[PDB]
């Protein structure tokens, strides 16, 4: 079997560039299946992604918190926007990142049910404020920072290094390199 | 453009052609031409030649009100199709000046209105359409001298009139032969 | 556009060309040109040059009625094809003024009408087509001086006439040589 | 086997973004197969979708009510428009949603047999009133609200939170998170 | 195995949106195979479709009547135009529909050998009258209504509810819901 | 296995809408394989098609006559143009059709090696006369009608009903329906 | 458009260019130009410059009959290709006025006719083509002063003539040098 | 297994419409594999094709002559242009064709390394004369006709019937039909 | 169009530009302009400005023969590229009037002819090409005052001449400086 | 077209704009405009306004030689970018008449030449490019009054000059303020 | 298994029209795998290709020389440009070609890292001279001709016949045909 499938056998979910609502459903399907196979074993989620739709990433967030097995999160590469919520969402003591990892706190982009309401500007601006509120609130619950602080940083597109992400409360540890020579 | 050159030369002879669609773009072009000719000389008639399958009911009404306000008689001719709004216009020319050519075909029928927007909007557009259509039928009854009941019985069916029948029915006053 | 410039210069010489399609757009352009030339000077003839495969039967009838109402003789020339409605028009020119060039090819045939709309509409369009076609055959019989039975026997087959045969048959009065 | 297929083995149907008439047939095929495999075992349907065609979602609704096995429904993410009917349609006591789930009551969009009738405006407006009537009626049967109340909310695009959805009668419970640390 | 294939094992044919001449051949292949596997066992055909080409749906009709095994038909969702013939065509006593099913009697659309005959209007109008005659005749044989009655309704796009379809002779029973709570 | 493959196991070839030279090769491959598997067992060919290229349908015709196993032919739906030759080509006593089957005798369309010869009109008209001659000749050999008669009917696009096709010599029997109620 | 401006200025000098295709559209444009120039002043010559690969046989015949009926001498020049119908036209200019430039290339060959329509139509188009082509060969024999047998022997092969050979053969009366 | 694969098991190569340089490589791969599997058993090649690139068809020609196993060739349908060389190339006594088969001797079309040389007209005309020489020479070696005779016929697009092809030296026998009734 | 307006104003100053391609369309446009200017006033010179990569050999020959028959001196200027047929034309201007600007680049080379049609046609086009090319080389030898052997040795290589070298070689009579 | 109308009105004021690309098409248009204005009145100056990123080196040289041969002073203005060939042209205006506006940006840099054709042609185009570029650098050294070594040191780096720096360097004689 | 896969089992690599950098990697993967499976057994590479990118064909060249197993090369059809290097690169005594094979020595085309350097003309012309030098040098090492001789022929697009290729040093033998009749 190809990797990804070997990774699934090892209870590893790899979250990549496919961040459409359509793929969010695959991540949720993977979490639901790994929990039923063995509720007492950790699930590792690797994150390397340029954010994604906020609505579907919140659906993943609730699934991750719903599931009984601990989920640990590892940031490889990128954890932009909304993926930073999913990174912070892992079980405390198990949020990890590699040294050149970058966590990017951004306002969520407009997506979800934006089908074609007439007052698109009043409605979509309202959806944006709601999404920003959820991102700020959700990160505050998982990082320890007041939502007001998170907003100030979110509004400025603050980008955190793997070490800064610890100080900001997203990462518990920065993974060491293992140099054999 | 030979096509546009010919129509400008005809517009100077006070002749307007309706050759297609009767959509909002065509209605605005015709409204502009009727207003222009009436502005240039209101003492003279305008001749409107119709060869059209018809179109939107609201577009046809814009043309009709412009024809009415313009202070000049408008003669109308069916020189092929005068279908749906094409018939409405034909019948709306003044009395004694509505004409059809012998192989003209006149279709009194209704427009479909057209469905656009969200389900919430479609449900509303339909009411405005029903209101406009009721007025279209009242006016056709007045134009042809028919009971409104016959206008509805015939407009709700795909009933074509030959030029000779269209005259008997009241859409046309005269058939042009030579 | 050299093409449009040449046709405007020819229109001033009272010459009209039918070079293609005979669709609704072409018929409206030709109807506009016939009406324009007759309006400019009804004491003079109009020369119509035909080189066309033909088209819709209703488009050809619009041109024909316009040719008839216009108060001026119309001469017609087959200068290549005069097929289907192209023949109808050729034959519809006035008597003594229908011409063909020696290598002209005249096809008396029928249009196909054309199928559009839902099955419910197609079934109706076919009746209007059958009626128009019956009139086309009556008129060709009158134009050529033939029994209608021969017009049907020949129009229902892909029967081409040479210019010399077209004259004998009655579509053409004269062959132009020099 | 990949999830989704593991989920099917566990009698779980996952209803996502594929909400075309073509996919409605797949949902119905899944319900018909799970019932025949074991009529006495519950079927879980996970819902995360931006509505869909009303006509085909009503076809699913009847299949769900036809089937002898209890169907429980879980809203993950979205249950927009017509999917809210399918969410409400699960067996009472078994309608569930995650906290950031949003149930959106909207008028159904125009679809189904809209092949090209001449009087499209009179006909399609009539189809719309019929579809609205079915949505309002169907939700009233499953939520306890009068159809007249549902209409007032439907006409205003009311969006319900997972908790509001209980008060509105769509959800029986809001699923708890399981925080292990 | 995925449903559809499980449904085939259970002798169920699911007729959906794929109503092209190309797919009509698949339905006929399925009927021919199920009959040879066991001529004495019923075949269930589920119908949920927006009509289709008339010519190929008549080819299915003859195959259904040719086959020795009883074919029962269930309307889920739609049975528009020509699919209503196939619905009526099932063995009497076994034509069934769900309550929100809609059977739509329409004139057949133009298809089949419409390759490019010169006199398309005279020929295609003739094909239309022939197709209408077959639809009216075929429904009369399976519904009990005179073909003249069927024509009057066909010409007005009459749409039947699952209950009206019984009165009209297409459906023998309307399937009950099984509410467990 | 899916039908079509089950049909092949039963020695059934299903000839459908795929009537390109490319697919003619598949039909010939199927005939060659079924003959080698068992030369003494009948091959059933089901025909439902809108004609096709004449050149490749003649290639199938020769393969059918070359093969030792009897080939029986059943017309389902359509047997237009050139497919009528293949229908007539089955072993006498075994040409069959369903009641709503239509056999359409038409002049063959232009195909085959029409790569771009300069004198396309003289050459292609010559190919057309050759193809018409083969169709007329081939049907005469299998129907009993003089080729001159066939030409008169071919030139008028004569369409035969399943019963007329017997009188015309293409079909030996029209298949009965099996009504169980 | 500089291109169209230059051609209008040349048309006023009674010069017509055939630079491509000889399809139905080109033939109608050239026929219109020949008729226009002859109408403006029939006492003067028209000069036709040819640089064309050729085209449809029926299009070339329409141009040819127009050249003949027009009451004015037409001079023709091969100023590159005069191939197929381009040669027919070149050779059809009047006698003493057919010219070629030294590097002109003249190809007497046949058109392909072209295959369109259903198999039933293709089989018919081919007969009309064979008839037109037979007339093309008769006319080339008359234009060049050759037995028709040589015209067929050469036109059925891709045989190019140099300008000097074209003169000897009879397509061209003079070679223009300076 | 599907035919084509069953045909390969029986040592049959079916050469169809796929006559690109890319597919010529597949034919050569098939010949190389069949020879290694059993060098003493005949390979049957069925030919039904509208010629193809000359360069790649000559590559097949050399492979066919290189291979120790006899290759027999059967023309079904078409053997245009270059495929006639491959047809003639089979082992003498084993070149066969069906009665409605047509062998078309044509000049080879321009293909191969025509990448974009500046003097395309001088170079490509030179390639054409070389290709014509190889076709004429190769057919002379396999048909017995002088290359000069072949050129005269090639230049006129001569098309041979299955019987004429014997007289011309391409076919040793014309296959009989096997009529069982 | 500023571009076309500028060229019409320049055409009235008897200046013609060859800025690209030398394909059949460009050659016909240039031939028309040369004929027009010579027709308007044959007592005056025409100045041809060349900045072109070249093109088809037959297109270049059409321009060349037109330049020669026109009864007026033609001056030519290399104002960038004069490549392939661009060089042929440059060199074909009259003697004492062939000019190059200092940064002009002159490429004596051959056209590729171009491959079109079936293998049977390609094999024929190549012979006509070889004949035209042989004449191109003869003419370049005459234009430059070189042995034909040098013209072939240089034209078969991608050998660019600087404006100063082009003058020494004989393509250009003068270099224009100020 | 307002854009073309404005430029024609400006061309009559002897003002030429170079707003983009300096490709072969732009160079031919500018060369035509310079030649036209000089032909209309050689006693008056031409003002060239430059706002361009630059382009092909050979296109820029065609414009430059035309500027030089034209018998009239040419003033040049940097009114945004004068980059690469845009700088070459700016610097090539006559002395005392090279201007920059205060927010103008001047980039002395080299063109890339451009890679086209087969590997065999690319290897040759590169030599012609190296030769043209060497001349570009010699001319910039002469235009600015710099050692050629500085022109190379700066042109091989993406070194932008402010308008004030461009004046000090010698590209510009004056800065225009008001 | 299909050929190509049977050919791989027999240690045969078939190099065709797929000569992109992307496919060069597949050839290298095949050489690396065959060597590890059995370092002492010959690998046969069949070559039939219209050259390809020079950079990736040199990557194959080094892999071929790196590998311990002898690689023998057979030219079928074409060995244009750069493929002639790979043909010459086989182990001496084992370079072979079929009689109608053509080896085309051409300058390499421009490819590889041509991403968009500003001075594309100076840089790409430099890459061309480097590539030409490698082709000339590499062929000299494998053919025995001085690189200066190779350049003179390369610059004239010299095309070698299978026999000329022996005289030029690319081919050691020209494969005989095996005529059985």
Swiss-Prot record, chains A, D, E, F, H, K:
Domain of life assignment: Bacteria
Q: Which residues form the active site?
A: 81, 106
**GO-annotated cellular components:** cytosol; endopeptidase Clp complex; peptidoglycan-based cell wall; plasma membrane
The record's EC number reads 3.4.21.92
Q: Name one GO biological process term.
A: protein quality control for misfolded or incompletely synthesized proteins
The yes or no answer to whether the keyword Metal-binding is present is: no
Q: Which keywords does UniProt give here?
A: Cytoplasm, Hydrolase, Protease, Serine protease
Hey, what's the signal peptide range on this chain? none
What GO molecular function terms would the record report? ATP-dependent peptidase activity; ATPase binding; serine-type endopeptidase activity
UniProt subcellular location:
Cytoplasm
The protein's predominant localisation is: cytoplasm
Does the record bear Protease in its keywords?
Answer: yes
**Catalyses which reaction(s):** Hydrolysis of proteins to small peptides in the presence of ATP and magnesium. alpha-casein is the usual test substrate. In the absence of ATP, only oligopeptides shorter than five residues are hydrolyzed (such as succinyl-Leu-Tyr-|-NHMec, and Leu-Tyr-Leu-|-Tyr-Trp, in which cleavage of the -Tyr-|-Leu- and -Tyr-|-Trp bonds also occurs)
Sum up the protein's function in the record's words: Cleaves peptides in various proteins in a process that requires ATP hydrolysis. Has a chymotrypsin-like activity. Plays a major role in the degradation of misfolded proteins. Degrades anti-sigma-D factor RsdA when present in a complex with ClpP1 and ClpX. Degrades anti-sigma-E factor RseA in the presence of ClpC1. Does not seem to act on anti-sigma-L factor RslA.
Family per UniProt?
Belongs to the peptidase S14 family.
Its assembly, as annotated, is:
Fourteen ClpP subunits assemble into 2 heptameric rings which stack back to back to give a disk-like structure with a central cavity, resembling the structure of eukaryotic proteasomes. Forms a complex with ClpP1 and ClpX.
Q: What is this protein called?
A: ATP-dependent Clp protease proteolytic subunit 2
User: Which organism encodes this protein?
Assistant: Mycobacterium tuberculosis (strain ATCC 25618 / H37Rv)
Encoding gene per record: clpP2
Swiss-Prot record, chains B, C, G, I, J:
Q: Where in the cell is it found?
A: Cytoplasm
Its domain of life reads: Bacteria
Q: Which residues form the active site?
A: 84 (nucleophile), 109
GO cellular component assignments = cytosol; endopeptidase Clp complex; plasma membrane
Q: Name one GO molecular function term.
A: ATP-dependent peptidase activity
Q: Does the keyword Membrane apply?
A: no
The alphabetical list of record keywords is:
Cytoplasm, Hydrolase, Protease, Serine protease
What does the UniProt function comment say about this protein? Cleaves peptides in various proteins in a process that requires ATP hydrolysis. Has a chymotrypsin-like activity. Plays a major role in the degradation of misfolded proteins. Degrades anti-sigma-D factor (rsdA) when present in a complex with ClpP2 and ClpX. Does not seem to act on anti-sigma-L factor (rslA).
UniProt lists the family membership as follows: Belongs to the peptidase S14 family.
Q: What protein is this chain from?
A: ATP-dependent Clp protease proteolytic subunit 1
Q: Which organism is it from?
A: Mycobacterium tuberculosis (strain ATCC 25618 / H37Rv)
Q: Taxonomic lineage of this organism?
A: Bacteria, Bacillati, Actinomycetota, Actinomycetes, Mycobacteriales
């Amino acid at each position: 079997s190809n990797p990804y499938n070997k990774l699934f056998e090892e209870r590893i979910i790899f979250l990549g560039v496919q961040v459409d609502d359509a793929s969010a459903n695959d991540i949720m399907a993977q979490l639901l299946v790994l929990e039923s196979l063995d509720p007492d074993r950790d699930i590792t989620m690797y994150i390397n992604s340029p954010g994604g739709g906020f609505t579907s990433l919140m659906a993943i967030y609730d699934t991750m918190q719903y599931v009984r097995a601990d989920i640990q999160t590892v940031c490889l590469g990128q954890a932009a926007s909304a993926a930073a919520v999913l990174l912070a969402a892992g079980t405390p003591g198990k949020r990890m990142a590699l040294p050149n990892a970058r966590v990017l706190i951004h306002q969520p982009s407009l997506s979800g049910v934006i089908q074609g309401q007439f007052s698109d500007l009043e409605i979509q601006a309202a959806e944006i404020e709601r999404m920003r509120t959820l991102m700020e609130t959700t990160l505050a619950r998982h990082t320890g920072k007041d939502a007001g602080v998170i907003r100030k940083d979110t509004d400025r597109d603050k980008i955190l290094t793997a070490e800064e992400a610890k100080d900001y409360g997203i990462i518990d540890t920065v993974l060491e390199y293992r140099k054999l020579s | 453009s030979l096509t546009d050159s010919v129509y400008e030369r005809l517009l100077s002879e006070r002749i307007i052609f309706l050759g297609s669609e009767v959509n909002d773009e065509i209605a605005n072009r015709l409204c502009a031409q009727i207003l222009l000719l009436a502005a240039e000389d209101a003492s003279k008639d305008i001749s409107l030649y119709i060869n059209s399958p018809g179109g939107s009911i609201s577009a046809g009404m814009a043309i009709y009100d412009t024809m009415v306000l313009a202070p000049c008689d408008i003669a109308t001719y069916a020189m092929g199709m005068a279908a749906s709004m094409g018939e409405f216009l034909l019948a709306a020319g003044t009395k004694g000046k509505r004409y059809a050519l012998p192989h003209a075909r006149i279709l009194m029928h209704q427009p479909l209105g057209g469905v656009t927007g969200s389900a919430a909007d479609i449900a509303i557009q339909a009411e405005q359409f029903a209101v406009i259509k009721k007025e279209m039928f009242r006016l056709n009854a007045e134009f042809t001298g028919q009971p409104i009941e016959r206008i509805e019985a015939d407009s709700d069916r795909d009933r074509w009139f030959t030029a000779a029948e269209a005259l008997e029915y009241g859409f046309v006053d005269h058939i042009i032969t030579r």
